[PDB]
Amino acid sequence: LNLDPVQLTFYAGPNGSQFGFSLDFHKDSHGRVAIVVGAPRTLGPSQEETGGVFLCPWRAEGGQCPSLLFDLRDETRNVGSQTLQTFKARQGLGASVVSWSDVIVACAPWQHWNVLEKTEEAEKTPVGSCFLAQPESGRRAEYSPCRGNTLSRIYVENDFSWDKRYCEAGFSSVVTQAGELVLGAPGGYYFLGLLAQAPVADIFSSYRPGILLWHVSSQSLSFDSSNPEYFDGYWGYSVAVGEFDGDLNTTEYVVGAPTWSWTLGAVEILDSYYQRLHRLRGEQMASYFGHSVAVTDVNGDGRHDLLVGAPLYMESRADRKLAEVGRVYLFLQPRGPHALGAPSLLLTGTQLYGRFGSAIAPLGDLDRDGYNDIAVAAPYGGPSGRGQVLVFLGQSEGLRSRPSQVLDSPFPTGSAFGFSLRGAVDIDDNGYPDLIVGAYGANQVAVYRAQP
């Protein structure tokens, strides 16, 4: 309702860098909020694409940002009569970024890995990797839970069980309040998908440069399955955390599997041991239900609610015709040990090919009335197709069907305005939470400030 669309601040990255593909707020130890921006096609120092990360200090005028340095050199280690190899070219560093406490976690989902042994190999595959940085000290660490040293022949002899070679760990990411990093790895277990969890403290304390294969003893990975419903489900395409079992001591995971069960799609709510607590099935095949997931209490009752995006949902129209517009589903958490039922509300896009529900961001309480709010992106929405972000305010009944406010893209066609979104943080210290919108196609990020 009260985001100011006139006085925008633009931050920009290099041409072709996809600056704005991902973003987050980052608060230093002093309390000063900056903006972390991922740029997965940034050219490294040898003119090869590696991706990169930028840390933008808050300024009304915006502009250019300093690049948060990471090691972009390939590594080789001859140990145990094997040869371990990392490959950082086209790794997509900054395809996701997330901040927790004084730490930034930037992932490279397409970082490749091989292990050679005489004439045999593991196979050169995208295991992915996450880079961790503590800016105020310079500390660096890495985490790459899917790297292995098993040869190709052994997977074949075991019918490809526990095959983590194509994980793309870091494809999605989230951090719990206690400092547990949770990574989505949609290529896990031969494209079923997996989650990898480890405490940030233990990632830092167990990492040393050049080792490449090491143990994080506190880590916890989800499980493989022979159930064909899960095949090619991309479980981990998106991920979030919340409180859904009424026990504040435990933390629950929300996982999107957009192609689960022959492209029906699904979202699952899990406990921290990865036991399924509830499954929400997609409505329409190929709609990509589970592309985006968001967790926030929108009806003021203190219990987290779930929002799921299906950005290729096709709406029925006159004379038996279908129109790809996208859809968002709201699930309100009921009282007691009861299950999440059917959706309390369905928001459907209006522009053909707009991809409404491609991103969903909790805003906190944008208007300070007591109910939390959300923003939904339609990256190719609006009459011209340049992109649109729609603000929905929470209320006792859940969300309002009519958006309180529409943000039209200020960038040209192809910008993907809204493809990434973050809110719930007051960047300028005015008492109202603000919104940051990435437009990777235009290599820029727009900041909208909430006003009284």
């Epitope: 280690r77 001859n78 140990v79 145990g80 990492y207 050049g210 080792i211 294969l213 090491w214 143990h215």
Partner: antibody, heavy 119, light 108 residues
Framework: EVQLQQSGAELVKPGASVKLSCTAS????????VHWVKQRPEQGLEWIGR????????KYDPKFQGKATITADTSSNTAYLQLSSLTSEDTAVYYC????????????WGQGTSVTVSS | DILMTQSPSSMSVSLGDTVSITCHAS??????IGWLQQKPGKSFMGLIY???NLVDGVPSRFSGSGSGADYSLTISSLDSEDFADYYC?????????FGGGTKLEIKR
């Protein structure tokens, strides 16, 4: 606290077999490679082999192939070393070992198990 | 197999000394070396992994160095607890192999 707890001193006859054990305390045995190492006063330290208890796969030094068999049981969090065809050269102290962080390192050791072969 | 030659096999030293134990590999092992300590009558404790990294809890007076085929363990300012046996181990190649050991003994 990571601790490898090995079984007690063994007094065994030549030509017989013995099976030594190493039980994980404060961690799970499948977390890492587990190695077995031999120590004798004059000949020093010799690596016997290793097991990945997650899947049972083993490697051996050729000198011990066909004498030493390493196994593991994740149910009881225990790794085992079996020595067949005991001879006077097998009188030694035997250690189980695992790495701290580096997959390939040899950082944590059990207290050792003394085997004495005699008639 | 990689032969690990450790030197010296013993040294007579005093409290507060700084001393080095060397290990020479029969080929390059690119820092895939560990250093181990055995106190009299006791088992083993790991000191260093991958050339220079201290095992958790190991005092900072222990340090590792070297490259290629030649490595060193240095103990700065010897403590009474440091009179013990020390061994290198390589894990560049299977089979892993150990040096012959160095005994630190008390000078008098």
């Amino acid at each position: 606290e990571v601790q490898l707890q090995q079984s007690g001193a063994e007094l065994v006859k030549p030509g017989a077999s013995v099976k030594l054990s190493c039980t994980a305390s404060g961690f799970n045995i499948k977390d890492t490679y587990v190695h077995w190492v031999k120590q004798r006063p004059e000949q020093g330290l010799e690596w016997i082999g290793r097991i990945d208890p997650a899947n049972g796969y083993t490697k051996y030094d050729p000198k011990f192939q066909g004498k030493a068999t390493i196994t593991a049981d994740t149910s009881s969090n225990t790794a085992y070393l079996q020595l067949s065809s005991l001879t006077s050269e097998d009188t030694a102290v035997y250690y189980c070992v695992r790495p701290l962080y580096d997959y390939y390192a040899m950082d944590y050791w059990g207290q050792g198990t003394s085997v004495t072969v005699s008639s | 197999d990689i032969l690990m030659t450790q030197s010296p096999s013993s040294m007579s030293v005093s409290l507060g000394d700084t001393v080095s134990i060397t290990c020479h590999a029969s080929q390059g092992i690119s820092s895939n070396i560990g250093w181990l300590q055995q106190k009299p009558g006791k088992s083993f404790m790991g000191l260093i992994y991958y050339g220079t990294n201290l095992v958790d809890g190991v005092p900072s007076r222990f340090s590792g160095s070297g490259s290629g085929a030649d490595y060193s363990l240095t103990i700065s300012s010897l403590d009474s607890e440091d009179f013990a046996d020390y061994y290198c181990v390589q894990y560049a190649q299977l089979p892993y192999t150990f040096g012959g050991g160095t005994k630190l003994e008390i000078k008098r």
